[PDB]
Short mmCIF file of N, CA and C in Angstrom, two decimals:
data_model
loop_
_atom_site.label_atom_id
_atom_site.label_comp_id
_atom_site.label_asym_id
_atom_site.label_seq_id
_atom_site.Cartn_x
_atom_site.Cartn_y
_atom_site.Cartn_z
N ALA U 1 -0.23 -10.20 1.89
CA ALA U 1 -1.17 -9.59 2.85
C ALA U 1 -2.37 -9.00 2.11
N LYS U 2 -3.61 -9.31 2.53
CA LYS U 2 -4.85 -8.82 1.86
C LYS U 2 -6.05 -8.56 2.78
N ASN U 3 -6.04 -9.04 4.03
CA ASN U 3 -7.11 -8.73 4.99
C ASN U 3 -6.98 -7.33 5.59
N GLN U 4 -5.74 -6.89 5.85
CA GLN U 4 -5.43 -5.52 6.28
C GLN U 4 -4.19 -4.90 5.61
N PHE U 5 -3.50 -5.63 4.73
CA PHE U 5 -2.28 -5.17 4.04
C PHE U 5 -1.14 -4.74 5.00
N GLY U 6 -1.14 -5.24 6.24
CA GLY U 6 -0.20 -4.82 7.30
C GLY U 6 -0.50 -3.45 7.93
N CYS U 7 -1.49 -2.73 7.39
CA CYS U 7 -1.90 -1.41 7.85
C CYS U 7 -2.82 -1.49 9.08
N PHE U 8 -2.68 -0.53 9.99
CA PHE U 8 -3.62 -0.29 11.09
C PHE U 8 -3.60 1.19 11.49
N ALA U 9 -4.75 1.76 11.83
CA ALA U 9 -4.90 3.16 12.27
C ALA U 9 -4.21 4.20 11.35
N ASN U 10 -4.25 3.99 10.03
CA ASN U 10 -3.58 4.82 9.00
C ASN U 10 -2.04 4.71 8.95
N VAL U 11 -1.43 3.69 9.57
CA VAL U 11 0.04 3.54 9.72
C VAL U 11 0.52 2.12 9.34
N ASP U 12 1.74 2.03 8.81
CA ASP U 12 2.49 0.80 8.47
C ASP U 12 3.05 0.07 9.72
N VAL U 13 2.26 -0.03 10.80
CA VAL U 13 2.71 -0.58 12.10
C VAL U 13 3.04 -2.07 12.03
N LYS U 14 2.12 -2.89 11.50
CA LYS U 14 2.26 -4.36 11.47
C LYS U 14 2.95 -4.87 10.21
N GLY U 15 2.94 -4.09 9.13
CA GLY U 15 3.65 -4.37 7.88
C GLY U 15 3.44 -3.28 6.83
N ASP U 16 4.01 -3.51 5.64
CA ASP U 16 3.86 -2.64 4.47
C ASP U 16 2.75 -3.10 3.52
N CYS U 17 2.16 -2.15 2.80
CA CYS U 17 1.27 -2.40 1.67
C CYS U 17 2.02 -2.26 0.33
N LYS U 18 3.24 -1.70 0.33
CA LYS U 18 4.03 -1.47 -0.88
C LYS U 18 4.20 -2.75 -1.71
N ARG U 19 4.34 -3.93 -1.10
CA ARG U 19 4.38 -5.21 -1.84
C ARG U 19 3.10 -5.57 -2.61
N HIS U 20 1.92 -5.15 -2.16
CA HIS U 20 0.66 -5.30 -2.92
C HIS U 20 0.57 -4.29 -4.07
N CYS U 21 0.94 -3.03 -3.85
CA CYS U 21 0.84 -1.99 -4.89
C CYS U 21 2.01 -2.00 -5.90
N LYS U 22 3.21 -2.47 -5.53
CA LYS U 22 4.35 -2.65 -6.45
C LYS U 22 4.04 -3.67 -7.55
N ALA U 23 3.20 -4.67 -7.27
CA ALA U 23 2.68 -5.62 -8.27
C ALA U 23 1.72 -4.97 -9.29
N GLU U 24 1.16 -3.80 -8.95
CA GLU U 24 0.40 -2.90 -9.83
C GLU U 24 1.30 -1.77 -10.40
N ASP U 25 2.61 -1.82 -10.14
CA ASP U 25 3.62 -0.76 -10.38
C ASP U 25 3.28 0.61 -9.75
N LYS U 26 2.60 0.59 -8.60
CA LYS U 26 2.05 1.75 -7.88
C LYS U 26 2.62 1.94 -6.48
N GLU U 27 2.47 3.14 -5.94
CA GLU U 27 2.72 3.40 -4.52
C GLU U 27 1.60 2.74 -3.70
N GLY U 28 1.93 2.25 -2.51
CA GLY U 28 0.97 1.79 -1.50
C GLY U 28 0.87 2.75 -0.32
N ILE U 29 -0.34 3.00 0.20
CA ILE U 29 -0.58 3.93 1.31
C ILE U 29 -1.70 3.45 2.24
N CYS U 30 -1.40 3.37 3.54
CA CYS U 30 -2.32 2.87 4.56
C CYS U 30 -3.45 3.87 4.88
N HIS U 31 -4.68 3.53 4.52
CA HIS U 31 -5.91 4.23 4.93
C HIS U 31 -6.68 3.36 5.93
N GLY U 32 -6.58 3.73 7.20
CA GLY U 32 -7.23 3.06 8.33
C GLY U 32 -6.65 1.68 8.62
N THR U 33 -7.51 0.68 8.62
CA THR U 33 -7.21 -0.76 8.77
C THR U 33 -7.10 -1.50 7.43
N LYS U 34 -6.99 -0.73 6.34
CA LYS U 34 -6.86 -1.14 4.94
C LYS U 34 -5.78 -0.30 4.22
N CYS U 35 -5.67 -0.50 2.92
CA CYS U 35 -4.76 0.21 2.04
C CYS U 35 -5.48 0.71 0.77
N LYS U 36 -4.85 1.68 0.11
CA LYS U 36 -5.16 2.25 -1.18
C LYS U 36 -3.85 2.33 -1.95
N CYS U 37 -3.88 2.06 -3.24
CA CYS U 37 -2.73 2.34 -4.09
C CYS U 37 -2.77 3.81 -4.53
N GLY U 38 -1.63 4.48 -4.45
CA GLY U 38 -1.44 5.86 -4.89
C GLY U 38 -1.10 5.91 -6.37
N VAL U 39 -0.19 6.81 -6.75
CA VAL U 39 0.29 6.95 -8.13
C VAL U 39 1.19 5.81 -8.61
N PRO U 40 1.26 5.55 -9.93
CA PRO U 40 2.24 4.65 -10.53
C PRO U 40 3.66 5.18 -10.30
N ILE U 41 4.60 4.29 -9.94
CA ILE U 41 5.96 4.67 -9.54
C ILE U 41 6.78 5.12 -10.75
N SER U 42 6.52 4.51 -11.92
CA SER U 42 7.26 4.70 -13.16
C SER U 42 6.93 6.03 -13.83
N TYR U 43 7.96 6.79 -14.20
CA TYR U 43 7.82 8.03 -14.98
C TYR U 43 9.03 8.30 -15.89
N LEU U 44 8.76 8.89 -17.05
CA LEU U 44 9.73 9.26 -18.09
C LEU U 44 10.25 10.68 -17.88
#
């Protein structure tokens, strides 16, 4: 998913963005009709 990352109206309604951001080893978070990656999931 890359046109809206499954996100709409700031919510995971139509799908998740976590599959796009997990490939960056990051959290995924729905901002509007798009997504932003949050922090990296990995920590020591």
